[model samples]
Target: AITKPLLAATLENIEDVQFPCLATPKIAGIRSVKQTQMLSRTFKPIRNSVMNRLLTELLPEGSDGEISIEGATFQDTTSAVMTGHAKFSYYWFDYVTDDPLKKYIDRVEDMKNYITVHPHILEHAQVKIIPLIPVEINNITELLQYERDVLSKGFEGVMIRKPDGKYKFGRSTLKEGILLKMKQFKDAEATIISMTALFKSGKVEEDVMGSIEVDYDGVVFSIGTGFDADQRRDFWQNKESYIGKMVKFKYFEMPRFPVFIGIR
Candidate 1:
């Protein structure tokens, strides 16, 4: 699968593979606390915290220079582990250009090819290698719509990329090389396994339906909601067809997963 190319490369004995940088900037003063908190929510808290500190330390004193930080420390949670484990093989030419987004994306592509050939290192750990698609988002509406569509299509969420004009990291007033992530809405699908009739004044007044496990992202989640009078009689009566099927809806992707969260 194109998604699991890193795994294929490893099994084939290809050596010298390089992965892209999963970590973006997440500083305090430079970026928003929300962005930092979002990054912290993804991956391990310790790892995200450390990356944020490193970004602060790496910030130039007076002269601004492009800096690229990569590795598993700042990886998206939904993505396979291999993508983050890939090493940072190169850096941008600071003197030549100041566009950090282009520099980081370019370097990520280079690193991805390097890891594709190095099978031994690739197999050493569990990582997901994702394609370095350019961050082509234009506006906030596009970003929101992309999130909704991806979730509706069964994807965990949408990954936002910075424009190709600037080269700054962390959250800045200017929108250049920052990555944004939006999680799926809170919803899911499940099978109606059983139903019970509600009794009032010694008479059957309403019916209540109970749902079984909800299937999502290869996992099962329990779901049960109260039904109204009309739904109890009409919807609860036909529970047979709804069983052993799938229902797709908005769902909250947990913070631990990097894909659902973002850094400024």
Candidate 2:
């Protein structure tokens, strides 16, 4: 959920923060916003076609007007294959829409309830819910403890949500001000132990570099995807020099390397 807003403690330009809320792991996946917009012209009467019926996608970023032609099966099956889950069929981590549920649900809690009850819709398109848990912090000490406990459970991180409220879409702020967040991880140093040359593209003929690996506490992983082609080429040409460069990298509080780094 990209619904970002300011935290309670934030003072500078603080719009507001809701007290008594819940938190959950920030799920990662393709975000799909659904509505009546994509429905076929023949599906003009939505109440008869989709009131109780499930859903499938029509126009994805890449697909060519398939919704209007391919009958949306392309999206349904494609998504089912993407998640590779049997129970879910396929799912989007963040999905919003003006479905029949909207006619009854206005609060976040109601939205969740509305989704859980829609069994047919779940089988067709994946509308995943982040189970935000109720939390209270008596002090900073307890907050730290809570963070450590949450990370230990193998969750990506936690997301805080106000109880029974409208989802705020976007709220940008200053460097010190945080709108929405959770204690995902604490910062630490990683030693740049090694470099593995990965190329930028499928073509090996160019030999252009993509990323460089680093080793932290005997565990080697890649980090330098931030570099440009010139940087990659320059580093690769003088690759041996960066072998012992001790630089900082962000990692989850566990022994795993980012779960995965960068976008797919």
Candidate 3:
């Protein structure tokens, strides 16, 4: 859908964008790279394995150009994970694609098609885009409840936007929001792969481990986990023999948000 030139430009712009830190008291302050590095060092040893796994799952092959924990910065280390999602999502739209249906559509061509064709039907509909918020949600139950509340108000799903950036349009902008739908993880366990450290100076560094590909009824969902912790944490780890292999968990009929915008 999206032209190669536009997609390439978008990706290039995304690479130039910066992530917001989670450190300031008001949840609005931006942190420097140096500060993020110091904070990440404290948690890297304990979370490395988990972080590594997450990175692998989120980032595709040869897509780790800017993700790092070495000189990264953040406002709050514990809350950085969710905030990082916002940053990642903002840039993800730049690389939209239509194929590999199971994974996120981030290739420029795919996004162009989505925008022009409006496949979901709701694409051309007028809708309000919400800002990202940071909430301390720990379990699937809590996450589901939140989705119900938002959907009840006619929203597709909750947009987990970061609190550190300004609201803006375009995929390359750091202010772009991250979207999360309850349906995406319904009845499924997302493995942790890697951990990233953000420094006060606004630098992000990460370490990666192995990869986990999820095979659900012949539909392959590749999950990357095992970056920070040597051992997988039970909370987000796989329980079946597919611990290191692809396995089916649960499936959703559609995305929680049927209409995806600013995406291909």
Candidate 4:
């Protein structure tokens, strides 16, 4: 199977999408309040020892095609386990192969069929399928309510997809409308600790800012996007004026993928 899992784009990336799309809860690793580095959600396919073994043993011996399994590994925060390995929950059977036919299952009905056909695949305690809900979202009101409902259920957000949308490798656009994510927009104030100069081959672009490093709740990450060309040039010229100042950023889980908003 391929190492990288199919990721979803954000709601802002989509403009036109079909009504009555399929949505699944976006699972995130349970983070510790004290942890500094955001490494839990950093890896692709999120491989662990036990989960990797299941893929090799349970699947065919010498398969001609790849099997993509999407899931999140969460640590047991409240209990004491023997191995202390993060538990894996298999949510989506993204791609599968049957002899000559290799299909990337994306439709709501097809996903359900895969789940129903493979009962043992989901029977393991460390591996289980998450809920898949079909939503009839027509307008902003309906979409907002559904997002609230999904977040209320303790998920990170909703992975909204067109009913019959095919799986794509990277982020999908508004026109494609294959799959997009809708997460709670969270904002936090961070102080700019440092700034990197935009560099060319061996020379620095003295007039443009490369990125701004910020610290949010002790988690430090860089913001390269969300700044316009004018802002970048202006900020770089007077870079010291922005240093040690509070800046606001929008992100989903902490500052894992933060976008610089503006000076707070």
Candidate 5:
């Protein structure tokens, strides 16, 4: 049951897991938001917000200097619905460098500290913070309504986070994913161009199956997530049967594999 790592997860045991979540709009911004100090958007927002932030803010400018920040960057369009000024959110979760000027942060509180320390970086950006709170599996029902109530406000969605969690850095984890995303997207359709088993590092058994290609609305795309085992054994094992069956895709926009015997 090997899985593809997404975000770095804590080594701390995950028992009372799961949180009500937010859907960060696919608006162009940062990803992972971590680097030695480097790297785009749905493409563009990510490039400017995360990549250059690594070079300009996260780097130490002087001897024994420390500076690190990660966040989302976006500008308000002329349109009225999202009417607002361009802003950057400096409440980031990770950093890079062996000798950071000051202490490297390991938790959310440290992230807030950097916001106040670096006025030069934040003067142009807003100190963004996740709408955070403590979670118990018992309280999820109350919180989900919060998520539902939030969407009508013209926001992407609400984000749920563990109030006292530490940030762990490294390979993305298929295990103990803490942040759960809840949001909406416009959908598109494509067929099962192909299907294959998922591959995880240093393993031989199958868990998630490979994603299929899609040809839709004159666009050919590859959707690599949102798949499970049921789709694999029931349809993919009989591979040819669903080759032309339609796949409903949820996305705001895109053209996006794993390998197959045709593994090119």
Candidate 6:
């Protein structure tokens, strides 16, 4: 059975988190770099062929037969468009396979040690270990500065993790406090081109703003969030008043996860 990689909860949902924790650069990639088994040191059959090859060649041979590694694959530079090539630079030793005695190296510290403890097997050009850094979050200003610095380096964000946290199978809940990611959310203003209708079953639900489509510098995208129930009804009731009006929104990438903020 194939296992999904552990997902981090958005930093927005978390509070009351402890400081002096562990963190790593949140690598932005088209797809997650996850592999559990490599047969005879010949890897293939993944979305990214270059990623498969990186694991096939760089990883140590006969490291107890089989092992799992997790990381992010970039294209050319650290941060680039994902539609082109693959350049795997960071990785985490998730686990080692066993027919009758499987071992899961879930602890964050242990996983970092797995690579640092084995220098010969991991050393290569443009393919290196994802090192863990100890962070003190008590200083809010300093923390924000660090995040800004990471973003300046062309990274999507920073992943703040619990030092002793274990690698989970799926998404981690905010209450679990296992891991959280801080991203550089950008805001922009777009003109409302049209609004979509809310559909229920086969009939269209009337008198409600389902979502709004906007044009920002020729990039058209739809936003469905950041509106309350009353606002939706009111906007729909007076659709003419809002059409062609400039509205502000927040997003991670162009036309991706754009959330409506307010009419400008």
TM-score per candidate, chains pooled: 0.30, 0.35, 0.18, 0.46, 0.35, 0.48
Per-residue CA lDDT of model 4 for 1-264, tens digit only, reads 222234566776223445666666665543111011111222222124354455444433212112212221234421211133444443432442322123223334454565577667566665443424355577654565565455434456666766556545345676666667776557679989988877638535365888999887797888876676777887788988988989876655424445676787
Please report, in order, the local distance difference test score of every candidate based on alpha carbons. 0.32, 0.38, 0.29, 0.52, 0.37, 0.55
Regions of model 4 farther than 4 Å from truth: 1-4, 13-18, 29-47, 55-87, 96-108, 131-136, 184-264
Angstrom error of the Cα, residue 135, model 3: value is: 5.4
TM-score attained by model 5: 0.35
lDDT of 6 at 133: 37
User: What is candidate 6's lDDT per residue for 35-124, written digit by digit as tens?
Assistant: 442332123334334644665565443121112122323333323322224334443423322221232223333445656777664566
Sort every candidate by TM-score, greatest first.
6, 4, 2, 5, 1, 3
Output the lDDT of residue 237, model 2: 75
Clashes of each: 27, 4, 80, 2, 10, 0
Which stretches of model 1 miss by more than 4 angstroms?
A: 1-102, 116-120, 125-156, 163-167, 172-174, 183-248, 251-264
Cα error, residue 98 of model 4, in Å, equals: 6.8
Better of 4 and 5 by lDDT: 4
Candidate 2: C-alpha lDDT: 0.38
Best by lDDT: 6
Compared with the true structure, what per-residue lDDT tens digits does model 5 show for residues 1-264?
A: 001112433323223335432222212223423333222111122234333453345433211111113221233221211222133333333332232223322333344455458645433433333312223333544443343334322234333333332233324242434343444234456656766566639643535556677666666766555543555445545767778877655553223211111211
For model 3, how does the per-residue alpha-carbon lDDT over 1-264 read when each residue is reduced to its tens digit?
221111011112222222331110111112111111211212232233343344343333222112222223443434443343322111122222223222222333333443356334222122111112235444444544454444333233433323322212223232343322223324444332232222217322432223344434444444332123432222124334334432223323342311111101
Residue runs of model 6 more than 4 Å from their true location after superposition: 13-16, 30-44, 60-88, 91-106, 132-136, 184-264
Best by TM-score: 6
Residue 213 shift from truth in candidate 5, angstroms: 41
Candidate 1 residue lDDT tens string, 121-169: 3232222122333434444444444555454333445433332323343
lDDT at residue 231 of model 1 (Cα atoms): 41
